[PDB]
Amino acid sequence: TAKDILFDAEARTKLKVGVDKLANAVKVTLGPAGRNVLIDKKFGAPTSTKDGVTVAKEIELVDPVENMGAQMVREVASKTSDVAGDGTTTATVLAQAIYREGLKNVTAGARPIDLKRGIDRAVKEVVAELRNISRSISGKKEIAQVGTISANNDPEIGELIAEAMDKVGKDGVITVEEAKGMETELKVVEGMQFDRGYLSPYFVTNSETMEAELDEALILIHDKKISKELLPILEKAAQRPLLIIAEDEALATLVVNKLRGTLKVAAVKAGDRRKAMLEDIAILTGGTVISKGYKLARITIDKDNTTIVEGKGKQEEIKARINEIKGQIEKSYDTEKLQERLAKLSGGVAVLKIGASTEVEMKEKKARVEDALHATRAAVQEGIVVGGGVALIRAAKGLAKAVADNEDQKTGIEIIRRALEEPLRQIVANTGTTDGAVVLEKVKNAEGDYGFNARTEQYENLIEAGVVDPTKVTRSALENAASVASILLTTEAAITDVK
Amino acid sequence: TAKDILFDAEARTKLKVGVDKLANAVKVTLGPAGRNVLIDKKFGAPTSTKDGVTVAKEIELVDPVENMGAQMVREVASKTSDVAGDGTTTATVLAQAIYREGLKNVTAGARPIDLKRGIDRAVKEVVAELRNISRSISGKKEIAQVGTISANNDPEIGELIAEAMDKVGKDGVITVEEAKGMETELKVVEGMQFDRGYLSPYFVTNSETMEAELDEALILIHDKKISNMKELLPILEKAAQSGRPLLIIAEDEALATLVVNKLRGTKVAAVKAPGFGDRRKAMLEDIAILTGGTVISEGYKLENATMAYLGQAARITIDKDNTTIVEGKGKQEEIKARINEIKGQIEKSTSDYDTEKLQERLAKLSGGVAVLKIGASTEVEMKEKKARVEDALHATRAAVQEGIVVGGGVALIRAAKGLAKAVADNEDQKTGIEIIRRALEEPLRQIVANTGTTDGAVVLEKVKNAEGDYGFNARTEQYENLIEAGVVDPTKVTRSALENAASVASILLTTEAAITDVK
Amino acid sequence: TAKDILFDAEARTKLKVGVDKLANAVKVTLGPAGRNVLIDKKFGAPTSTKDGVTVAKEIELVDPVENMGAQMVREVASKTSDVAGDGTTTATVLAQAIYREGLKNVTAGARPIDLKRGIDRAVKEVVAELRNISRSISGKKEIAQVGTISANNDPEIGELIAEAMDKVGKDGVITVEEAKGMETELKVVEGMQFDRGYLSPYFVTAELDEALLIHDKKLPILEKAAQSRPLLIIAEDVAAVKAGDRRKAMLEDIAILTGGTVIKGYKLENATMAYLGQAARITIDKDNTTIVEGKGKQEEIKARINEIKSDYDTEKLQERLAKLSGGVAVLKIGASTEVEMKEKKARVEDALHATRAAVQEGIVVGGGVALIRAAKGLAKAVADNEDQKTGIEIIRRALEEPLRQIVANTGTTDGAVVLEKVKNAEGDYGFNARTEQYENLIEAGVVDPTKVTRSALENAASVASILLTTEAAITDVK
Amino acid sequence: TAKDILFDAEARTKLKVGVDKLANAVKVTLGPAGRNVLIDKKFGAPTSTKDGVTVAKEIELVDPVENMGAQMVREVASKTSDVAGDGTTTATVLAQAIYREGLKNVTAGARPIDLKRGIDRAVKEVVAELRNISRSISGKKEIAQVGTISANNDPEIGELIAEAMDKVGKDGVITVEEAKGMETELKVVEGMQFDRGYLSPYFVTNSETMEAELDEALILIHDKKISKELLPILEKAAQRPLLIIAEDGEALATLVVNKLRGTLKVAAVKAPFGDRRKAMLEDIAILTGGTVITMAYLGQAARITIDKDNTTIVEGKGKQEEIKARINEIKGQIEEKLQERLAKLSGGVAVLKIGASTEVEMKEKKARVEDALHATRAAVQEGIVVGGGVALIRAAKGLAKAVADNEDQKTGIEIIRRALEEPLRQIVANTGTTDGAVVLEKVKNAEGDYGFNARTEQYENLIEAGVVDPTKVTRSALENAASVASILLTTEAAITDVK
Ligand SMILES: [Ca+2]
Ligand SMILES: [Ca+2]
């Protein structure tokens, strides 16, 4: 269709309006002092949410140029919680500050590409200093402590996550499921996980976790493309859910039936490494690959992940596949990919069964366990830092190592320096305090983990009081915010359809 | 869809208009002097109602942000009369007062978070003082006295409610049904109650009470989710040959078939199974042996279709929060054996948790269901006094729990004495406390205002300077002793009205943004 | 659906506009001098009517709040005519006057509730005095005269009602059908009638010969009884009629008069057709169901009478004795042509209904004079304050409105003098709008049943009291 | 339908508005300093691209006359990247500058046709001088250098391109597929290609590459026209896709509906004229194992790729002695186009199997090879000039040989003179510096390969620094730009439908 094109300053200023509309909406929920946001419904009472992810997913604008900038910062900041599980709102606040002060200097005559270089060099040094203050977590002692903090002072949850990672390892597969009663238990079952996600978002079973739950599901292994093709195998299977695994018209047939009352299915994709894993996935679930003269318990489907929990094969035939994998190990960079498959079959999947007195309390703990698990998995990888937005301020000391080739690149370093204070400035601002300018000054002049705690409105040691953020959360927020702001600063044109 | 966003003062002020539109409409019906509200109808004469709940259900606004505030106060205040049986309009009047005075101070420089803390600390002390001034109701004598007051001075109803609570206890299951004649009687029949709702409001039989009533219904017990609408077709078709309604008890768009089929023609309802996990499979058997049927586990829904496996009961009532099975057709023989089985498992007493967890299951099959059959000379007279029994029953149920206090809004004023124990960390928190102090007078000030007098300021002064149960009775327009005169409220109603009102008023003060779709 | 809300003065003022629009349309038809109203139709010539009820049923307004006030008065004033024969327009005129003066004082600062208390106290005393001046009607001579006046001065119609009420009694069942010829014949036939009626609007046909089903509780017999005779279905659920403690006792009474039995050891699915009571002819319209010649056992019906023959309950089942022992008189009216027959047959039904009401609560002077005479009872009305006293005064001036509208419809501007000459006079002296002369209205034949007059005032004060106490009007957004 | 007509200057001015909107949007992506362009999406985050080809395809205008000017320049400039593999953005920048100065002199009173004559004489001289300063590429040493440059300094890619051209020759057919594993290999099979592509774009299997890919399809040779008729033999092979090769309407649309729907994947390609087309039909039979005009008459093998202007068959179904029998028959005629007939079967097709560590890196490396392969074929053909827009400035010395009859024709010569420096002026402008006027004068004064490198923002020798463009790219962008700009200068009327 026809287009409307905006150029340079007129395009960048209108993008700022959309970025500001997104940020100002989500940033009021930042921190423990975050305020309440009302999201209207079509009928009934509205939704009261203090979560910044809920507010962000509802943000949409009438003006397409403003909506572009709002959707740009949304997609980039959303990639923070994908590999971490927290910090989307922090990245959004940072992205607004980096882009606001960047445009001010671009208007002043600074080169946008030099401001980008100064930002990119400043970010590498802030992350460097950020890892210097990072404290790694390993062992069932301090792992259970991180899980207890993320579970809001629940030591029984921390040990459940600690003893789970002591079986399959720190890189192992951990799954949370509902128990059969008050007792919470931990067991390990045969299963694997790969990096192929769902083909369409319409396969999501519950928007709470954005996953797809298939209970007692049949598995279909196919090495060819999709575009349905074979009705009888698919139609007769509807007489238990079915997971279809192919190499790629037929997708629309599965989406309509997914929303339909019956025929509940999901579609997940799978060189020669894929041919061997399909037979390995079929030997685990007892199925048969179709490639080869073939003609015609729980499965969790995430965005980037697919996990088969307790796939039922033959116990002896699955172990016979293990002998073939390690047998080829002794016969050989190429051997690294083969040993990965060895840990998937023999490693298993640790399942965390959570239960409570009532059903609403059983789903209460399951919500906290999945949150505590996701945060602890990130704390084991890149470590932990001080929360409350202080770690970004402490990491500002590393800016002295940033080298600016000219004045404009030095300005970009100053933009990052002033942006690091914005998350803490907003956390104090959400308390309704008019003195928040002094609060930032005391925390900045201090050292270490000393900072302002917005929950009790008291100055104390944040790590000692349980206020901490995963290092992966803090560094990803700054990297993503600086990424989207640099793309918007260097954007000379904005193209959109005509209404 | 694209969104429009309001921020801070502009959002809170727009939300206040919706709360005022809701409150000003419902509050004219408060008290015995409450005035009449005309509600337009599609065709014919309009509906005249003095009931604040009926007026509240009709309130809807064109402005999306204003409608949000109106629906916020509506849902939270509706929870007052949900558990306590009354107090919805009082919760709305209190919510408008706390929110109005709250917004005045926010624009004056007060932090909303410290106001909320001052609000919450004041309410905890006012509820505390309500507990101290509350008279606990116990014993067959005064229970009938409370039931007589709630019945509008009918001694027969109070004695009937008191006798019902004597058979099944305080927590027993009591239902109100129509009788066959002028004689009012009480019948205790075998049954139980579990908390589960219908899977869709379209199953509701009588939209006035929002209940699904089934006479001589068939009970289908299944422990797994049904998404099929295929394997269940032969057993559902075999129920059409019987002609009696069907209640499907399962774990769970297959429910859309039964919702549309029963709405447009031929009469069945479905609810979720009670509990979960291993405790669900055991309760489904108790809900089976009681109704005279068997559980379908892994038999199957497709094959093995037998009406002997289906249970049946005389009457089954399903509200949104609960499902009641009255007079199950299961024989008394195996029911006695099921009791000794659970009592034998309770005699083992292994885990301290499972000990009382199993007794909750035993008490449902032991105490049964007490049925109150109400009748009169004419059919229209029975429907009048049947609604009075259902109101008097729910009022007495709440009176036995938390006690009773003085009505006429005086208990809220008397409970202000507890504000001296409310500690304030700063002036903003102290401001939130005096916001609660001025809000407690609002229910009485509105009750007096509904009399039409301009002297309400003087009436509020006499009652506050009075002592104990002395207050103004808006019905007779006389200063007297309200408890001696029969003006009383369950303590649960009064404390829930203030708690809910302060809850929704605190959320709106802490609301910095309002998101709504573009028109 | 979103709503628009009005409060207090704004709400009640717009409600008054709708009430004024309804009253001003119907009140021009009041009295014998009432004027003419044209009602548009879809195609052809419009309908012209002097009847206030016809104009009332056509009143619908575009403004929802104004329409609510019009439908309020319409529904309440229509209840006056449930059993009246007249008086629907009078109740609307009274409701307009009470509500107008009510709002007028509410704006002046009077409490609406104190006005309502004064209104209700004033009505009880007016109705009390209305019964003191009322004259009871009993005996075939007085009933024949009242029936003649209700027949538009037809002496034989009044005698027909009197002789029919002479054999079956004052409370007896009287029905009207069409004669088979010129002769108008009255004959007492066996049967009973109750107050129930058809459960739906349809099946008007309801004339059923050889009815040939009594079911107390909530299928194959319908197809069985169809071949071998229209069936009547009496149950609590080719015609069906609805059926507390005295309900089942009368089910056996109908089962004895009919040749069947009540279908609780009887199942409606397994019930034989021999249990179906068969009568001669059944006539069912809306509020009544008439059974004629139930064809039951004369020995069983005579035995059930002896079975019947502690205070209000003893007289409750004593009315069932009049069902079996008493009969149903049939009035068959005929003439030379069908146009003169069906018209005269409708005049008998309208005259019988008025005569039935005159026997119950009595008769009072017409022309709106009874409401003015009954104003003397207001001296017994006790006022607790000045606001309630103004409520007494509202009713006082309201009672003059019906007579003032009758004189206004004559087109004269002298109606103010006619109202004063009536109030200064005592007794039955009044103004006859037919001859436009002063005379005694009872001797002149101008009279209304006391039930008609008291119901118009009680209903008018009722609907006007609700509107004065209405603080809110909620309507759907356009 | 009714029309709106604009005449002369009124029509040419409106066309310029559309030309400017196309150029100004695409030109910000020109050069290594090119800046991002945000293109809106129906839902989700918008597309951010630095590619001028992606931006150009999105430009569409509301005004009909303005859209004509944008579509004229876009289609003509797209022919640059079609044959030469690149330079479609440069052609748009040149066409904007030529048409801008053209209209400016037409308003000054210069005859448009003499401006066109002056432009065309100048282009022939600039292209001639561009050939003089070009450097021919030959041998495995020079080809490996060009392939490594187009691969962003990846010696494995440059050597593979030179090795592939070492077998099939300079003009031989080279195709790129995806390898079955980590190892990158090379294989040669017996195949041929012809200049006839697909009949309809709806047969495209893969998008954004403007092509169609048939994996393991069947070939049918038909000498007549296809207008349901031959359907009886079509469903016999429907129980694998098939490739129909015939002279061509009615039944062609039936295959279009079956394409987008996904039932019986098929593609139609015109037969390669007269007796010569039937002669190549036998070569398309014997080599492909089919029979000219039954399931025995349809050959097949490997994968068939179908471009717009091209179609390729791979590896054939023919027997080893069967292909040699027809090769001896064509070689039977001794004593100019008959040599190209036997150069197809005997030439073969070189298949490039590209692979990487993961599946995501393979498609990034594969597209890198496909761009390098297309860039190398232009280097071996017309040579290589200096990049960075310097070759257009150096070739301006050839304007002395251009003979101008009158002043208007001399004006056209100078229009080309000022336009040749426009691409370099835009590359420096994309850096954000306001001093770019100095960079242009400093490069113009220097001689040879000395020019400005916008990647490092420093002056150097561009040929030794890796900055180079194929001569075919530079000369085509100028010839295409001057072509469309001359048509618009001579356009006296613009006719378009009424809205
Ligand atoms: Ca809405
Ligand atoms: Ca209407």
Ligand SMILES: [Ca+2]
């Ligand atoms: Ca859009």
